Amino acid sequence: GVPDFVLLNQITENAFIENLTMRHKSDNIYTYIGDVVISTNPFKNLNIYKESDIKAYNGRYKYEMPPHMYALANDAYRSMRQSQENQCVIISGESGAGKTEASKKIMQFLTFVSSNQSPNGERISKMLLDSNPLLEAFGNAKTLRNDNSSRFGKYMEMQFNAVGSPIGGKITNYLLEKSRVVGRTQGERSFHIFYQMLKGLSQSKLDELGLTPNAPAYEYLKKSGCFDVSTIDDSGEFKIIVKAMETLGLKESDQNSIWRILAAILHIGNITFAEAAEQRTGTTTVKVSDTKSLAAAASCLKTDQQSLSIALCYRSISTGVGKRCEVISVPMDCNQAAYSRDALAKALYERLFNWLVSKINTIINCTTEKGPVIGILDIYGFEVFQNNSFEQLNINFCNEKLQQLFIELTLKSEQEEYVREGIEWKNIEYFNNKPICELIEKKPIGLISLLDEACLIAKSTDQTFLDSICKQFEKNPHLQSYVVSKDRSIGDTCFRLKHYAGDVTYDVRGFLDKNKDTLFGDLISSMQSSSDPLVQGLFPPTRPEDSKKRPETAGSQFRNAMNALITTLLACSPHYVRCIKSNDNKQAGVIDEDRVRHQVRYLGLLENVRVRRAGFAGRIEYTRFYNRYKMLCKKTWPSFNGTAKQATELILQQHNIDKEEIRMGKTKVFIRNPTTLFYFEEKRELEMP
């Protein structure tokens, strides 16, 4: 027979893939690895999602029913039930590849288990389940790796009601990709809202916003050079977004309100410059002859057109116990001018979206009870191109922290729990804990510590900055380039950064202005002092979960954002969920060998199969091995003491077997070579006829 996976006729790497393929090819999605979930997203309806199935995975164990509930939860999720404490789940995988449908499993599992009666429960649950595709039409954009690419960090939180159902949850994001608005690769496309909005709204609505049916005319859409996409037809897709607008609770009144922000931005975006070499010598200034663009920019803000340009493009400070008189002038280069221009254009919309989703919950979130919180992680995925750059580093950097997370959990915090119980365990080949990859970019003498430092040294452009890396490193382990590693594939200006997976080379175009992020309190304060129910509203009640002190470069602000992600994950009891994509054609039956094999490769899962386990040939569990050879051993009956370490010893000591002949960890039994299985079968034969 040999069902499932842990009974393969030939326990090898090749057979593992062939089986896993046959599994997914036969509607067997969920798969286990020691005690970790591995699922996929069909992106459509399969006949395995009903009340019967959900009710089935509750009050049982893993070795009783097919893969879905993974006992690790039933144990851990119950381990804290002794302490009535809260949990948190983390999900990783390709961008927009159901991290939307992976959470669905958690929710569908959460309900019923948490619950029922209340007519105002299952009904409002519908609008909540439709909240996923809701937010995937506004903030999401397109990527060459995925179409439904979410463009905002999200750490959801699940609370509960007195009846059982949930009450609500909060949302938190970080950084937000904000270099796509001005720069991107050919073929790709910027945010959806800018294009889907055009091919839809009545021409009458466009003219009111001072718009013309022609992207090239603007700047926001000209910085790229592309306008029409071959695959997308926003003219028809627009009706799908509008159906989501009114259905939830975003009336045209609220819509126009939101558009008044973009209406301004589109009036501010037109502000382009014709390299003004005004200064006889000093530094080329920035002149705006076509003032109606800069005028319309302030018309929406209803601020002094003149003073605005004199108080932003020009920096000013005096000081003396009071708070200065702003007027003195500092015209600067185009790059810094464009930098300041964008710097505001991004953060202005970032705060809004995060405050918008909170107001979306105004007609959803409850405020009756306060209790435990089950968190769900969801962040941008590890994207892969045949040509990387800076914007990739930030995304790839998260994975370096994500791998550190697991090693901190499935290799450190968990191993310490083994010995805390006092059960047989010995440190089996522990591959580098890679804290070097963390120290290489945190404490003094580190990448971002050497990078962000260069971001401020404006006189250190890109070529000089490069030299501050090759010398600082290319000696420390786990980092190569052209010089040391004589490989022509690496340019003299580029370098070779080794992740925990493969190899990646980066360019340098725009590094500084894109990375600096430095946002002083000159572009921020302007809007705050404006007169509009939204302009100041986008800047919500001061200090939301982030106060301390305000005036300081954003270079450190973003550093705090990532630190707020790690510290809160260390001291807790996370849960692991990792998904794999079937194919890039959304086909139900087609398996791309190379692509799938690569995913299993660069994620280092089969290595855990040899580490998390221990590493050898034929493998079997303890839990699953138990309910199979029960009537073949002595003192291994329900009268067991409970102590595994003492139970396993009782299993072998009564049949006279040497200690070192076997190896016992926490889970999974380990007997080297097949012949030894015959040695066991025979040892039992010549002790009692």
- Report the C-alpha gap between 625 and 621 in whole angstroms: 5
Q: How far is CA 631 from CA 370, 626, 652, 689, in A?
A: 50, 10, 14, 15
- Report the C-alpha gap between 151 and 95 in whole angstroms: 10
- Report the C-alpha gap between 497 and 400 in whole angstroms: 12
CB 274 within 8 A of CB 287: yes
Q: Which two tokens stand for residue 312?
A: 């932003």
**386 contacts: CB under 8 Å, gap ≥ 6:** none
**φ/ψ bin of 449: left (φ > 0), alpha (ψ from -120 to 50), beta (otherwise):** alpha
The residues facing 377 across adjacent strands are 155
**234 contacts: CB under 8 Å, gap ≥ 6:** 195, 196, 198, 199, 200
CB atoms within 10 A of CB 282: 8
CB 495 within 8 A of CB 480: yes
CB 614 within 8 A of CB 428: yes
Q: Which three-class secondary structure state does DSSP give residue 506?
A: strand
Q: Which three-class secondary structure state does DSSP give residue 37?
A: strand
CB 179 within 8 A of CB 223: no
| Binding-site entries | 93-100
Q: Which three-class secondary structure state does DSSP give residue 285?
A: strand
Write the DSSP assignment of 555-624 as a string of letters: HHHHHHHHHHHHHHHHSS-EEEEEE----TT--SS---HHHHHHHHHHTT-TTHHHHTS---SSEE-SHH
Q: How far is CA 386 from the centre of its chain?
A: 21
* Residue that has been written with the tokens 């699953």 in this structure: 624
- Report the C-alpha gap between 564 and 558 in whole angstroms: 10
- DSSP letter at 632 equals G
Across 445-604, the runs of DSSP E, i.e. the strands, are 496-498, 503-505, 574-579
* Residue that has been written with the tokens 């105004």 in this structure: 362
Angle, helices 463-470 vs 447-456, to 10°: value is 150
**685 contacts: CB under 8 Å, gap ≥ 6:** none
CB 132 within 8 A of CB 120: no
Q: For strand 663-664 and strand 503-505, is the pairing parallel, antiparallel, or unpaired?
A: unpaired
CB 275 within 8 A of CB 331: no
- Report the C-alpha gap between 191 and 138 in whole angstroms: 9
Residue among 183, 571, 565 at smallest CA distance from 409: 571
Give catalytic residues, as residue numbers: 95-96, 100, 146, 149-150, 381, 383
* Residue that has been written with the tokens 């558009």 in this structure: 259
- Report the C-alpha gap between 177 and 574 in whole angstroms: 26
CB 199 within 8 A of CB 189: no
Q: Which two tokens stand for residue 677?
A: 């299985």
Q: Which three-class secondary structure state does DSSP give residue 104?
A: helix
Q: Which two tokens stand for residue 95?
A: 């961008």
- DSSP letter at 592 equals -
- Report the C-alpha gap between 429 and 432 in whole angstroms: 9
Total residues belonging to the chain: 689
CB 582 within 8 A of CB 18: no
CB atoms within 10 A of CB 90: 21
- DSSP letter at 630 equals G
CB 345 within 8 A of CB 265: yes
Q: Where does 168-304 have alpha helices with state H?
A: 193-196, 203-208, 234-248, 252-269, 291-301
CB 662 within 8 A of CB 671: yes
**448 contacts: CB under 8 Å, gap ≥ 6:** 441, 442, 559
Instruction: Provide the experimental method for this PDB entry.
Output: cryo-EM
* Residue that has been written with the tokens 């028809």 in this structure: 236
> Which element (helix H / strand E) includes 351?
helix 334-360
CB 424 within 8 A of CB 665: yes
Q: Which two tokens stand for residue 459?
A: 């006189």
CB 68 within 8 A of CB 30: yes
Q: Which two tokens stand for residue 77?
A: 């999720």
CB 583 within 8 A of CB 563: no
The span from the first CA to the last CA of the chain, in angstroms, equals: 29
Write the DSSP assignment of 223-248 as a string of letters: TT-----SS--HHHHHHHHHHHHHHH
- Report the C-alpha gap between 169 and 181 in whole angstroms: 30
CB 122 within 8 A of CB 135: no
* Residue that has been written with the tokens 């294009």 in this structure: 195
Instruction: Please name the amino acid found at residue 54.
Output: I
- DSSP letter at 382 equals -
- Report the C-alpha gap between 262 and 408 in whole angstroms: 43
Q: What is the stated resolution of the deposited model, in angstroms? A: 7.8
Q: For strand 574-579 and strand 88-92, is the pairing parallel, antiparallel, or unpaired?
A: parallel
> Which element (helix H / strand E) includes 158?
strand 154-158
**408 contacts: CB under 8 Å, gap ≥ 6:** 570
- Report the C-alpha gap between 689 and 682 in whole angstroms: 11
- Report the C-alpha gap between 38 and 582 in whole angstroms: 12
- Report the C-alpha gap between 487 and 491 in whole angstroms: 9
CB 42 within 8 A of CB 6: no
| Binding-site entries for ATP | 93-100
Helices (H) and strands (E) counted in the chain, each on its own, are 27, 11
User: In angstroms, what is the C-alpha Rg of the chain?
Assistant: 29
Give the number of C-alpha atoms closer than 13 A to the C-alpha of residue 528, restricted to the C-beta side: 10
- Report the C-alpha gap between 1 and 360 in whole angstroms: 53
CA-based torsion, 553, 556, 558, 564: positive or negative: negative
- Report the C-alpha gap between 481 and 494 in whole angstroms: 7
- DSSP letter at 536 equals T
Q: Which three-class secondary structure state does DSSP give residue 332?
A: coil
> Which element (helix H / strand E) includes 376?
strand 374-378
CB 142 within 8 A of CB 359: no
